[PDB]
Amino acid sequence: MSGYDRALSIFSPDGHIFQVEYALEAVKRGTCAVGVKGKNCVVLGCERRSTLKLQDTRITPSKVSKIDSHVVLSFSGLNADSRILIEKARVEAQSHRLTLEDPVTVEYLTRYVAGVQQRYTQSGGVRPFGVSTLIAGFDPRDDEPKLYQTEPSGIYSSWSAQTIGRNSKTVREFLEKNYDRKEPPATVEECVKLTVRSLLEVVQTGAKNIEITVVKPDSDIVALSSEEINQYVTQIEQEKQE
Amino acid sequence: PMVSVMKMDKSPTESYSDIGGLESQIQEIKESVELPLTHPELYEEMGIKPPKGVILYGAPGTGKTLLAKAVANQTSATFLRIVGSELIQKYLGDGPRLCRQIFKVAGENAPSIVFIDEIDAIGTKRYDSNSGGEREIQRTMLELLNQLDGFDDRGDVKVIMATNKIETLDPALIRPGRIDRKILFENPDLSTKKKILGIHTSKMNLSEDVNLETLVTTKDDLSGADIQAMCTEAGLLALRERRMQVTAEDFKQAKERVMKNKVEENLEGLY
Amino acid sequence: DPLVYNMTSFEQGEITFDGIGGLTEQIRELREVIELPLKNPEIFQRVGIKPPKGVLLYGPPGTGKTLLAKAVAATIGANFIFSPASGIVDKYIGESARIIREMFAYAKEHEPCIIFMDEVDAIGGRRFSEGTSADREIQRTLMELLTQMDGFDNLGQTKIIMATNRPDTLDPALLRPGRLDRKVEIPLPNEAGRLEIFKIHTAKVKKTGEFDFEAAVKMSDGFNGADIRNCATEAGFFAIRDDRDHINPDDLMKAVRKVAEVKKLEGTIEYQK
Amino acid sequence: SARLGGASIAVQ
Amino acid sequence: SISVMGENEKPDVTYADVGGLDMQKQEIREAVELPLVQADLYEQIGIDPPRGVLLYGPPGTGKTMLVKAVANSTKAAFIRVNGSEFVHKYLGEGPRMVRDVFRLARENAPSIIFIDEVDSIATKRFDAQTGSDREVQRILIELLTQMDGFDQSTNVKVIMATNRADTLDPALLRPGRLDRKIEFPSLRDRRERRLIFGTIASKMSLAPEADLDSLIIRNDSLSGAVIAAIMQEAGLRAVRKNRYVILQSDLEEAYATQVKTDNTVDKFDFYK
Amino acid sequence: EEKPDVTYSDVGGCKDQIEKLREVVELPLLSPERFATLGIDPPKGILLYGPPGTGKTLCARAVANRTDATFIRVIGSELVQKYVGEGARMVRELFEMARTKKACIIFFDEIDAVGGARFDDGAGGDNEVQRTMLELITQLDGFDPRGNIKVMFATNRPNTLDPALLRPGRIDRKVEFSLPDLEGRANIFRIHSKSMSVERGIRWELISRLCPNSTGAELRSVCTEAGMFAIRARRKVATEKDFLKAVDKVISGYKKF
Amino acid sequence: ADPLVSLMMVEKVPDSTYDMVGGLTKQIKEIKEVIELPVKHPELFESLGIAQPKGVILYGPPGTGKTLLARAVAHHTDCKFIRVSGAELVQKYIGEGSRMVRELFVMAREHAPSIIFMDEIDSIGSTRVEGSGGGDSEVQRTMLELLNQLDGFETSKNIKIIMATNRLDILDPALLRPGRIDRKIEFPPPSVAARAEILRIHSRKMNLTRGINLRKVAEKMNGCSGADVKGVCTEAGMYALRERRIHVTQEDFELAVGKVMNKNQSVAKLFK
Amino acid sequence: PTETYSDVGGLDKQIEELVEAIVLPMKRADKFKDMGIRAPKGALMYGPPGTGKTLLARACAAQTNATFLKLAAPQLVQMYIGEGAKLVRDAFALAKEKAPTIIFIDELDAIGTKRFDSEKSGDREVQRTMLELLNQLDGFSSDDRVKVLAATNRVDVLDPALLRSGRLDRKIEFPLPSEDSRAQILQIHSRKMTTDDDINWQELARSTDEFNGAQLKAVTVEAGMIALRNGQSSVKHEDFVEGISEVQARKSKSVSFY
């Protein structure tokens, strides 16, 4: 359908445009995810839907996905479409760093990758990106934490925490309860036990299923070890005693 | 006279704490029925009719009946259990006349109401009616559709029904002049499911303590009612024992089993 | 049913063969087969034939086959029924088909008597593997017919003839000889074959002029077998409209020329083999 | 009467 | 109540008035009447008898007739039934029509029944989305259980007949219900046609001064019902010339009379 | 029969047809002289239709109280299609009641299965349904042009009715009715939820903003469910947010089919 | 006093038992798991106070060993048994169907305990309907409720139904659920070891045979059914009966096995 | 009423052609019945609604007078029918006493059922009764000035019974009019009401588009009213402009950019 504006073009009598609300109506069937920014840190998390203990543990294509030392990306739903956005973002990173002689912001990044989708839904012979993503990390030489959520309609809206995909509405109500714009968590381990605990309702205590990074000033990026995670998975359950 | 055997007077068993643990709708009938007759002057404090009628949405094997089993004692007043299959006759006009009479006893049974099921026999938005027969079936509807709303001064009644699928079957009879509202059951949440089953096996051994909280998960969209099956499948698995002995693995062997029959989709696109 | 007790209208009435043209050999191909069992049946037993059972026609419509379907009535004096292959179906399943058993028996209770059946393409399908929810109904309605003429129920001393304008699409199981043991095509004839048909109308009405056909009929390479009765009356239709009530060969020409192009604008649709 | 209803029919 | 037939009528034909298909003229025998007549000899070994069968093939080929002589030679009770009357206006008339026939068989057993055609009421799917076409399936299900449900009978089973043999359910096409299937192909093999022409011809008037091999080897792709037509029509190639006994050229004048219509239907504009 | 007692103030809604139903109810009745100079008695008799309970009933009822008009309650399939002997015999008595009666109107409803479809020559058929239909068609044109009586019919669906009897001279017009805009949605809370324990100073359009295409009589239930929550609080009186919680339950909680 | 007429279906067993049902020993073990509980320590789950299971479905391909279990199980009943064959669609006077079923239980309620039976309710099974289809769907609508909310406190108390069908995936999902059913159990085709037994058992009464290893035939023959093999067990005798040697051989099994499917049998492998 | 032959426009072409097909049914039996040649026994014909076919039908009876009773197939649809089918067969020998009166049936046969199959529900009793009332009938060239007939919506959908097309096939599609015609039709429907003559229908005659004959009667009956909708005894004639579009009302609601 070179051109042809099949039904993406056809507005509705209600006003909406069918194939877009359809998209993120499809996104919720995929693995959840989550983001948090506390006082000085920023945190992310995902899951692995249960395999038969064959889903290759070593080189799995994961949910966190770096861009540089100071930015990452997590997402939800479709996967073959995820891999190109991850590419034609970090492309612009190596480019932006070059022809401006200094690295990216994040308010420069979410604008791009939230503006790109609009071209993949306001053009001909194109299907949208049936996907929803979020950005996370600091600007250079700045303590400030930021994450931005974006979705296929093309809008980007900052947050302090947010979840995407499956059973998020079973979750985010837990976070608005605990997390508050009053006062962050102090530091790293605080966010995590708060972060992980929120998942547990959809988790069946599969500690293997869930995978986590953090983000810190001076781009001290890292992913964490299942033991370090699992020893949070238990002591948090030790607190269940009532 | 004709319905004395149809005239129920049974005192059934079921109640709260015999319920599995729904909460979000246990009230709303007492809204529909109880707060009306418990204290109908507040209707006048609001200056209104407290509402009439109720239909249940499609929740096959969810509790679409059990509240009828629930109310039967908390009701604290009279009641009927009718159902649509009985309405239909080897003769022509002997059916619809029934609806005219049975409200009189309902008039005689002032603080008395009814539950109905199986109305999908009736609620049908397709009445070409080539025959002479099902024209009566339409005639079985009209007088009742009339007898319902043709009755005013429902100071005491609550004529209610329920089914498993409506969105393609029932007429556009819906009018607050006739029927007001419609309330839904469907599959539960995890913590909803969590309220369900130790309370069942509370009346049962648990030889050993087997942390059921990690047994089930929200991902497996169980019925609400494969679980009394679960609770007894394992004792069946001890019926596959001389041991009358409780084990987690028995539940493990069951949900693996029963869901071998239950459906499963392809995670093709990993969507 | 009483409906079988309604169709029979003109079971005998003779409109003989002199009132027909063009078909002096088809009828030689047909006076052969039908009358002989019903005239001198021992010949096929003289010689050892399993006698025929079933004939049909084919060719485009408005051509004179239905006349032939009744012109045999004149020869016999014996009985006849007329009936379509359309006004059979109804809502209640089987009621359409039960009738078929009702009627062949009704033949047996009074004969020599035979059957006609129009437009059988409606009951003339190839039994499909896939179908709608209902089109297989006629197929099960059909095969009763497929049965009864040659089924386990033996039969004799009755005959069927059918006709279409679309020989194709038919279940070959019908076309098994034994269910009908000779075919024929009635075409639009040649000019001379179109010429007897021209004059039979003059043979009745008051002619006035000499022949004046061979050039008139030079235009006759286009017509059907039945538009000419219109043409014949159409001449006097307006020969008289000048209040000239004694016809001529002057006025038909305006008619016979006229009809061709008003016929042209929706003619020559198909021919069906 | 001496009867009640019962029937069947095609749709198209 | 459904009917039954004895000696009011018969089909008035014979094994001798038919010929060919001889291997089918014995497989049928051992299933039906030999068990009815000669019982002990295999009850020496007491295996359960084979039972009613199916028999298919292209239209004609005696798919409907072979019954007729064995019917004449039945020595048991027998019917005259086809398929497309089981249906009725009302609903339960159908299944009610058919439960009792086995009772009628059993009330008159040992015996057997027949159907001339069944493919109308036997298909692969038991289609669902119409109030009509289930009520036929009920007619299928009921015999499917009355055939080999609990305690059916001594009898042999409902003898099928079709023009086709793929449309219909395997649940009916399997042992215990249709323990034998049969094909009736013609193929124009020369081992048999040199009889059955003569079989059909010997019964009838014939001039012993006449060719007969003028066509047999000359034609090789033939069927079984049409051939009566040529040596039907051969007589009609005579009386048109008021001849009272046939001649040799009648068949040659008849050879292409019935057959030779090989191919002219839109040859060039077929596919290209 | 002689007083419906329902006003223009009772009606919010689109409201505009009533000045068009203010056409034939008056000039035949009061003043043809406005049109006597050109085609006197120019209107002859009209009809109504609209989807269910869009005030199609209430509209004509809104004006029978006006003009001292005196209409009927033996209506539709209710009281003449069910208990039935010589329906026209009542109609002969009806016009016998109406032959000299003044300031009165015929009107009735339900006419889909009454005289809308002619049974299509099936469904068992009925003849008294037609004869009393035609028996009107006899009494119809008796003196109506020179006379003063009016005629009004109603349908949920006009084209679902019978067009056979629409021989003009016998019939003039069929006017439509649909859902109103917000303003028709506005002045109906001013009557419906008026008669309830509610607080004052309350804006009643945001709900109108947030209840698109929809008829009127369900708002009565929205009222019926509105006053349900101070209850639920064991509180007393209606807020406005109570609507908003209710509107969430009943529109997107109803559109699911 | 005495009950209605149409319930003659309460009646004695046929000739069958648990020797002639070989192979699927774990299945039959289950079908009395629903039977031994309430009877052999009824107070097992009752005095353990657990729950009371109830009726079941069993499906599979056609001719796999359903029905004989359903009858042979009655042989070892210690209870009462009934029958149906699709007669519940006696639909003239439409309500009579509903009358027919409500009577069906109350009688058994009078005569309880009584396990009961169905077969091929594939007829009754579905509910998806738009413009036509009713006139039976009532009778499914009622029995579904006949077990629930009016008698449901005692409806499925001590009546213990079963049900036997094909094609479980077309009818309602309402029916298969834990409500009214327990175990959607399944009859696949047999295994190589299974088929030997099932060939050895219809092989009983044949003859004083010899020189046989009756399993390699199973190795000649893939998963077909444990129902058709009596077929190949049958005509093996017939083929020798055809030539009058009452004594038998392995040669015939080699033949009759090839009799069935080689005649019951497209190179467009565009795929790899 | 005894309105003229025309009442419709200047369609002399059809009517002055048509009844030439009815003179012989009317008269002319001197040599016609001495020629004995074909006689259309009721010129049944067609053309969908919108036309004055009823008027062309009835106005032709202005010369051949005919009592005002003309009942149709919707009279032939009742419970356990056939007494209605009795009525039709008796209908003509009834009238055959002494009358050139001729009634006018009207048939929308499958306007109640579907037509997915061309094999169709050619209605029960009409298809039966129409035969005998047509087969066994003559007019005698006096007191039978025309022959009873009917008409239908569309000549594609019928199961032609015996002699349904044998002789009785005289039929024309009424050609829908043109601007020279049209403006003189709407003139007729204002012969009873006068207006400002500043703009003739001849001015309108180019402004028409897709207007069949019947609905044009829905023009001045309103546009005569749309004037006195504002109570002008002097009828204006631009109310046509904003009333003609009321055929479907245009949903004209605040044209945004136009």
Ligand SMILES: Nc1ncnc2c1ncn2[C@@H]1O[C@H](COP(=O)(O)OP(=O)(O)OP(=O)(O)O)[C@@H](O)[C@H]1O
């Ligand atoms: N939360 C719960 N509380 C109590 N019972 C439950 C709960 N969840 C499931 N059940 C079980 O579900 C079954 C009820 O299913 P459901 O009431 O939906 O069907 P039903 O209404 O009986 O069907 P029908 O009325 O159409 O016969 C009961 O056996 C009950 O034990």
Ligand SMILES: Nc1ncnc2c1ncn2[C@@H]1O[C@H](COP(=O)(O)OP(=O)(O)OP(=O)(O)O)[C@@H](O)[C@H]1O
């Ligand atoms: N081999 C044969 N021997 C003798 N007669 C034959 C033979 N083959 C065909 N015929 C003749 O042709 C006719 C064949 O009828 P047949 O029994 O084939 O009907 P059928 O077409 O098979 O029925 P159906 O269409 O239901 O299958 C018989 O009437 C018979 O006279």
Ligand SMILES: Nc1ncnc2c1ncn2[C@@H]1O[C@H](COP(=O)(O)OP(=O)(O)OP(=O)(O)O)[C@@H](O)[C@H]1O
């Ligand atoms: N294990 C077995 N032992 C002995 N015979 C068997 C066995 N399994 C199947 N059979 C044979 O299969 C037949 C039973 O078939 P089955 O009951 O599976 O089909 P059905 O249920 O009658 O068909 P439907 O499923 O349509 O009702 C019997 O004749 C029986 O001899």
Ligand SMILES: Nc1ncnc2c1ncn2[C@@H]1O[C@H](COP(=O)(O)OP(=O)(O)O)[C@@H](O)[C@H]1O
């Ligand atoms: N050969 C013919 N001789 C006389 N009339 C004919 C002939 N062929 C057709 N017709 C005319 O056709 C009409 C009916 O012919 P019919 O047998 O029905 O042909 P078809 O079946 O093709 O319509 C009659 O009016 C008849 O006058």
Ligand SMILES: Nc1ncnc2c1ncn2[C@@H]1O[C@H](COP(=O)(O)OP(=O)(O)O)[C@@H](O)[C@H]1O
């Ligand atoms: N603008 C309005 N003002 C007052 N009531 C209205 C308005 N619109 C709709 N209604 C409601 O619509 C209903 C009309 O009912 P009715 O017309 O008799 O039903 P039907 O149209 O099915 O005959 C009344 O209950 C009335 O309260």
Ligand SMILES: Nc1ncnc2c1ncn2[C@@H]1O[C@H](COP(=O)(O)OP(=O)(O)O)[C@@H](O)[C@H]1O
């Ligand atoms: N050409 C025309 N000139 C004048 N009036 C017409 C014309 N066509 C239709 N009409 C109007 O339509 C009506 C007649 O239509 P009619 O012949 O009955 O068609 P139908 O039979 O489809 O109703 C009359 O009211 C007449 O004024």
